[PDB]
Amino acid sequence: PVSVDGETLTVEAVRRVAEERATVDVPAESIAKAQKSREIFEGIAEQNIPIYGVTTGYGEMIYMQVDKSKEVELQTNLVRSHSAGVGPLFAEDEARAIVAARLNTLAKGHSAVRPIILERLAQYLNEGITPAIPEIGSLGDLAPLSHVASTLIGEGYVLRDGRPVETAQVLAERGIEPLELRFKEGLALINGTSGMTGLGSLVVGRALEQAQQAEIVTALLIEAVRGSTSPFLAEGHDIARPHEGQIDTAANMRALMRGSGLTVEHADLRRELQKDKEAGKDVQRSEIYLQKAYSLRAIPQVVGAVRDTLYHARHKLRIELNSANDNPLFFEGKEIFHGANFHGQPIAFAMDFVTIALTQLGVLAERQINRVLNRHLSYGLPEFLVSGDPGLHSGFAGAQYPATALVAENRTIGPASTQSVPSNGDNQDVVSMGLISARNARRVLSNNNKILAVEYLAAAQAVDISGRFDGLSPAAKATYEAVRRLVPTLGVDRYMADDIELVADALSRGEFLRAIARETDIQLR
């Protein structure tokens, strides 16, 4: 079970609830802290004193004072008038992550909402009731969260087999009686960063697994091309350049290639090269390369930088997940806090940074593909990995194009966290556009799986063409088998699309990270 206590929720926890339908539980302590903050708050709203969104209009219309006698209407009109989302609907897991983020937020106890709201949200998650949430509308997350809030009151739509269905129907067929929003409840359900933070959580968690799966195929490729292990030696990172991510990537690369009979040690390389040099020449040519190209050597530095960005994003997301990103807020013994914790700037930036970092991860993976397919660049491998008569067959020549194209495409994706546009009578004069940033990172993550899919297939192909299977390390063999289990060796030319999408789906499921765990002792950071 996952404890949604507004204090200890983690990015991985969110993914379990969202992706693996893990049961959720709001601890008694959170319910208690919620019921008590609600109790006090109600006594305040009963005196009809000015409170944003409770006894006043919303946004710019805050100058409008509303009498407590309207309590339920004010909250309902809000949820309805703001359910203005457009575009595609979020997938089931994305919608669950968002709902989980809003629940954790309210579970912190400063939102002044009745316990049944938390209970009803936890119920929807546990009973598989997923709101239909359109992706566009959030300025950074009113619209998206309004569609969620709608379902709690028997309105809006819920997801069922990919399509939206009236909430009223699904609820009636559940024996669940919709709720009636009271003081501040409508506002609290929609005034937060749960959309960008929920989706961001999924993206960053998966981004880290992608970094791992990139290291996994990179290792296999390095073995298949008989690269040097020098670039990954601990001294060059742990000692000479202590960036956390760099140290982690190098450690993972050393572990992945451990036991390989194909990789080369620097000592052997220079000795081999030394034997190759004559004594009378001041300058002489050699076919031996003491060092390989950047794409097969600067891995610790590049993927490591990506990891650093991802670590920073996860840290921000963890703080956010367990924060009262709502307004106004309640603190026992104090005036009602009127601030802007609903402003997603910290997540907007974090996700924009993830978009950039993942784009470079893809750039690296595509150049490695180029490396293995180019005869002048690959170590003893036929052009474009053609196993038969080249020219007559193109081998992987056509498969490189989608990878190359996705790099160009990811590069057309610009930062959204800096594109605020003033709205609502200039009341919202500076916003974060955070959910766009999150959707941007998701897109790159998705495109990267396709790029990586081509690389995984190319690597497995490089293995059988060279006849180097037996030399592969235990991990490389596991990776190879995982690919071959999905797609066979490329003999004559054939329709490629199905094979690529098959491997890319596997990557999106973390299937290669699983193969390593299930087939080796290796523990990847």
Ligand X SMILES: *N[C@H](c1ccc(O)cc1)C(F)(F)C(=O)O
List the structure tokens of 321: 């997940």
Select from 41, 90, 232, 342 the one that contacts ligand X (CB under 6 A): 342
Strand partners, 428: 423
Does 10 sit near ligand X (CB under 6 A)? no
The 3-class SS string of 324-343 reads CCCCCECCCCCCCECCCCCC
CA pair distance 340, 337, nearest whole angstrom:
9
List the structure tokens of 39: 């109790």
**Residue 328 is which amino acid?**
P
Strand partners, 159: 130, 164
Restricted to residues 484-523, the positions that interact with ligand X (CB under 6 A) are none
Q: Which is nearer to ligand X, 205 or 328 (CB)?
A: 328
Catalytic residues: 52
Restricted to residues 419-458, the positions that interact with a copy of itself (CB under 8 A) are 419-433, 436, 440, 450, 453
Does 424 sit near ligand X (CB under 6 A)? yes
Indicate the residue whose CB is closest to ligand X. 59
Does 191 sit near ligand X (CB under 6 A)? yes
Does 401 sit near a copy of itself (CB under 8 A)? yes
403 CB contacts (<8 Å, ≥6 apart)?
A: 365, 366, 369, 450, 451, 454, 455
Q: Which is nearer to ligand X, 22 or 72 (CB)?
A: 72
Does 392 sit near a copy of itself (CB under 8 A)? yes
Does 247 sit near a copy of itself (CB under 8 A)? no
The SS3 of residue 111 is coil
Restricted to residues 365-394, the positions that interact with ligand X (CB under 6 A) are 394
Select from 36, 367, 484, 514 the one that contacts a copy of itself (CB under 8 A): 367
Q: Which is nearer to ligand X, 8 or 427 (CB)?
A: 427
Q: Which is nearer to a copy of itself, 21 or 254 (CB)?
A: 254
What track of x and - describes contact with a copy of itself for positions 51 through 90 (by CB under 8 A)?
xx---xxxxxxxxxxxx-xx--xx-xxx-xxxxxxxx---
Does 474 sit near a copy of itself (CB under 8 A)? no
289 CB contacts (<8 Å, ≥6 apart)?
A: none
394 CB contacts (<8 Å, ≥6 apart)?
A: 384, 386, 493
Residue 486 binding: pick among a copy of itself, ligand X, none (C-beta 5-8 Å cut-off by kind):
none
Sign of CA dihedral 23, 27, 33, 39: positive
Restricted to residues 34-53, the positions that interact with a copy of itself (CB under 8 A) are 48-52
Restricted to residues 41-100, the positions that interact with ligand X (CB under 6 A) are 52, 58-59, 82
Contact 257, 263 (CB under 8 A): yes
Q: Which is nearer to ligand X, 127 or 401 (CB)?
A: 401
DSSP string, 120-137: HHHHHHHTT-EE--EEE-
44 CB contacts (<8 Å, ≥6 apart)?
A: 51, 336
Contact 154, 43 (CB under 8 A): no
CA pair distance 142, 85, nearest whole angstrom:
9
Binding segment toward a copy of itself, per CB under 8 A, in 19-27, 145-153, 213-221, 514-522:
145-153
What track of x and - describes contact with a copy of itself for positions 98 through 137 (by CB under 8 A)?
----------x-x-----------------------x-xx
Restricted to residues 146-205, the positions that interact with a copy of itself (CB under 8 A) are 146-147, 150, 155-156
Does 404 sit near a copy of itself (CB under 8 A)? yes
Residue 191 is assigned to a ligand binding site = yes
Does 480 sit near ligand X (CB under 6 A)? no
Does 470 sit near a copy of itself (CB under 8 A)? no
Residue 507 binding: pick among a copy of itself, ligand X, none (C-beta 5-8 Å cut-off by kind):
none
Select from 398, 414, 422, 425 the one that contacts ligand X (CB under 6 A): 398
The SS3 of residue 390 is strand
CA pair distance 452, 11, nearest whole angstrom:
24
Contact 91, 129 (CB under 8 A): no
Q: Which is nearer to ligand X, 82 or 182 (CB)?
A: 82
CA pair distance 468, 261, nearest whole angstrom:
9
CA pair distance 170, 159, nearest whole angstrom:
10
Select from 8, 418, 489, 523 the one that contacts a copy of itself (CB under 8 A): 418
Residue 21 is assigned to a ligand binding site = no
Closest CA to 18 of 102, 129, 93, 124: 93
Sign of CA dihedral 514, 517, 520, 523: positive
Binding segment toward a copy of itself, per CB under 8 A, in 20-28, 168-176, 300-308, 474-482:
300-308
The SS3 of residue 203 is helix
What track of x and - describes contact with ligand X for positions 281 through 320 (by CB under 6 A)?
----------x-----------------------------
Residue 297 is assigned to a ligand binding site = yes
Contact 22, 125 (CB under 8 A): no
Residue 489 binding: pick among a copy of itself, ligand X, none (C-beta 5-8 Å cut-off by kind):
none
CA pair distance 207, 205, nearest whole angstrom:
5
Does 343 sit near a copy of itself (CB under 8 A)? yes
Residues that bind ligand X (CB under 6 A): 52, 58-59, 82, 142, 191, 291, 327, 342, 394, 397-398, 424
Q: Residues within the annotated binding site?
A: 82, 191, 297
Q: Residues within the annotated binding site for substrate?
A: 82, 191, 297
